[PDB]
């Protein structure tokens, strides 16, 4: 019988941190809604204040901008009041929705509040649920801002602000200790008399706390003078209340009426349902008044009534006793000195983990979720890959060099002192010398079209495709990789190819090959991505600007996967000349970031493409993750003196903006990748903004940083990639995280720049030699990356280490694995083989889990082109030996040929029960969940129809000994239906089916004639009839290697009298049936002529006169089944014919099939003559052994490829993997993802070699130096 | 999640019991139909009689899935089988799919 009391505090509680916490919330939908609409409400009332108050009110888009001014003390009473009221309501709301705390009720709880808390108390007490509280809570926000605004107005009219305030709002209240309230009141009266103070300016007792404590308020100038008279032992603690409250001599009923005028009049206002403990009023307990009337009284508690805080404790206790409660459980919300409440109230008295959310709901909303960087590929100066790019950085290489002749002739375009037109003072740069290389065949370009395409568009296709494969992205494989969920963004500032190179002979592909919109467009078109496609031009910040746009799309949910990149290919001498004419460029060398003699930046070439995803999606697909983007923002340097020069004021506001949005602090960042274009003004300006944000200095001069900060610029190595600078900078970070190193900085040629601040004092460093950058245990490395433009815009992001991978995974029980290689060209095929072999030699003995993961990657996480290669084994060494052997044949002159266009054709052969064995299918049953489900489903169907249980056959094995014919036959058929469905799920679409004896039933389901249950019904009831009527051991069956003519000639007695032909399997393969006595006589007669004979294990003699007695009843069983036309042709040994119509599957069919001979030859020969079968078709046995396939093979040709699924002598997966290899080489589209689905241990994307492009140089050389003569006539 | 798992399991049994027809064109056939003009008990007798006279596996039989009112009820079965049974319920009886 405990009663919780909900107590709200006043302005004395520093709610700054609580506000910061609520802004970080993103898991409670009703909170974020309250926090979006509260500022709107707040801002709305602030617009109705007086001009004096509006001028002293800051501008803000969100509450985050008020926190710092609140902490500083420069926030006026109107906002700080509403802010405290927001924090209280916010904390209460979160506690009762996210915190799943039951809402208070009049039976077991009460609410109380002091000063501002009295407002919130009215709202809470007037609602019965969180949903109802919000609308009232928002009205309460407006009342709070009007309350502080009204008290602020009276204060300003009473006393003016003092001169040394510096914007800070002075204190109007102070706590006094060591004297009783009624004694302090007398000293006040005396002090008043002696100073002759006006009645309004007098100090007054604003609150009574305890027998010796109290609080006195007055104008600051007057309060200070009065407090100077209270000498020790008395105490004086100054409180943070910046306006007069609780002053019956300053406020009246009209002031209260004004504060609550924002509450529209209505009849639907809720009443106070939960008792409010109004201990500062005549009635300590109050309830029932309407929300406005209750709010007016609460406002009256703030302006008119003094705080009787000495009555708070007993007032609560008395209400608890009134309801027969023994104790109270305090639930304070932003209450100063709240801990003391519990004991103080109880002194007057005698005295489960949260449930996991449904999958898909645990994830936070898409808005402001970490965006994972899955992969990145690019081309950089002296670097054909990300790995060679790291070599440039870690070895401190300066890649700048004079312009090569492939671009333009420096002898005519460059001059020490440029006087002629279009001649520049510099010709330096960091160039991509292989920018012309491309694989036109791969991307479906003619040799005449490729030269016209901007190398930027080409290198975008290469890097984008490399990044996609590196990320294991296969279109439409998973939900996040659906074609309509993939978008493309690129940053590009220039189109030089279309201005200088192809413009020399405008041809048909001039526009599509030169226009920037085609940079992402070709990516969208080639990979068939129907999501958005954009190009961004913000000059030197384009790529990071595009990364910003892409992240917004992911956060908004327009796409699930994003392709982001940047391109910069320089072929127009005018651009360099123009840049030099504007003094952007360094005429001495590369970017000399941080060097005292920096004279500009050096143009650089680069192309980079990344793959992005919202972190949850990335983890759902088991994609690789190199890092995560926490935030990214953009502003503009509007406050600069010149349009070109950037300014530090705007840059810092951005750095702090992203730190706040991400919830981080300076210490959390350990590295900053700066813009750093090698400019004295730019480097000093940016450096000051970075340190003032990430390495601030104490007021005493010490370092705020506890750990060192490292700053560096990639441009000192590879120059300024302009539109591709942002992603180039980001690529460097991805490598720094991978290798856990900070590369040396080569920008400092001579001496450090003197404009920089004392970096050592701030614990900031410019690494001169490489520095270890290890990931902390159970921690993450976080980075700030900057990228600016001369147009004024600034962009920066916050980066973070990738999450820790899943520890468990699982061991792959499969002994044999399959590795798939593909290429579009014979040369590319040779390349991929070579590159895969060299890769296996590097990672040969690292771990045993590599081979399953290698298989998963090359199959499920790869597209498969027309030229194909395969290898299968149990360890990596076997795979190499196979691929090496295949490589040798390619080198010896046997070229790689593409698989036939249509792909393979399959015929499925369903075996009879003769070849079934114990423990058949157990490994399949264990490992494939779908197979287990089917068996489990069929089992329940059987028992439902009073048939034996087959699930035990796959689990127990021993039962196979004593199993009955009905159980033996059902197990076989369920096995075949489950085995067919498994192969169908793996991509085998049958061209036709053929079943032998019992195998026809499963074959009829695979053909679409019968449903699975009708098959089991038909099989079960037929076997039941055979046990009921027939007897084992009376008849037998005999296999004979001889022609039908020789068998008949050898035996005395015609067929149909002395015996019967049960099966006609081949030319010299027949099976006879009859009584044991009939077979004995025939077996001797055939052995007499030395013909090979052999009994069958079956107990009865199927397909002979023995089954005659069951045929009438079997006819009725078939009549019950629902027959439909086959979807694929049925090769029926029962009729020795290819069946295609349901007219042939009438009940007569099944009695005929049971009694009549099994004419495989006549059925097969009927199939080949129709062209349904030929040597190029693949035969797949759906049974316990390759029996029926041998009959098919004899019928079509000796070179036919036939495969078995199960075989008692070999491992199931060997056969399965060996068949899929041949299906793949034949051109089948295997469902590789399903092949690995039940094996999480293999589901890891490995970093494999990039596609072995068949590269040729496609270039349109700039000639005749015509750019230097633009505007001149022909002379 | 329970709802999707519920329908998936009923869907699995349905597919295992009866295959989708040839002229479905993606449209999912109806397994249940409402009957009017007859009492649930009387309709249950017509079902049992139809069962006796026709040839059906025990699992494929039509069954009374719901009793709505004194003259209303609902009968379910595989689409091909339900069509055959409903063809025997002649006016004044009613049949709403
Ligand atoms: Mg019947």
Curated annotation (Swiss-Prot), chain B:
Q: What induces or represses this gene?
A: Expression is positively regulated by the cercosporin cluster-specific transcription factor CTB8. Expression is also affected by nitrogen and carbon sources and pH, and is also controlled by another transcription activator, CRG1, previously shown to regulate cercosporin production and resistance.
Tell me, in a sentence or two, what this protein's role is. Polyketide synthase; part of the gene cluster that mediates the biosynthesis of cercosporin, a light-activated, non-host-selective toxin. The perylenequinone chromophore of cercosporin absorbs light energy to attain an electronically-activated triplet state and produces active oxygen species such as the hydroxyl radical, superoxide, hydrogen peroxide or singlet oxygen upon reaction with oxygen molecules. These reactive oxygen species cause damage to various cellular components including lipids, proteins and nucleic acids.
Q: Where is the signal peptide?
A: none
Q: Which organism is it from?
A: Cercospora nicotianae (Barn spot disease fungus)
Q: What happens when the gene is disrupted?
A: Abolishes the production of cercosporin. Does not display any pigmentation. Leads to fewer necrotic lesions on inoculated tobacco leaves compared with the wild type.
Which part of the full protein does this chain span, and how long is the full protein? 146 to 242 of 2196
By what name is this protein known?
A: Non-reducing polyketide synthase CTB1
Record remark: domains: Multidomain protein; including a starter unit:ACP transacylase (SAT) that selects the starter unit; a ketosynthase (KS) that catalyzes repeated decarboxylative condensation to elongate the polyketide backbone; a malonyl-CoA:ACP transacylase (MAT) that selects and transfers the extender unit malonyl-CoA; a product template (PT) domain that controls the immediate cyclization regioselectivity of the reactive polyketide backbone; 2 acyl-carrier protein (ACP) domains that serve as the tether of the growing and completed polyketide via its phosphopantetheinyl arm; and a C-terminal thioesterase (TE) domain that facilitates the release of the final product from the enzyme.
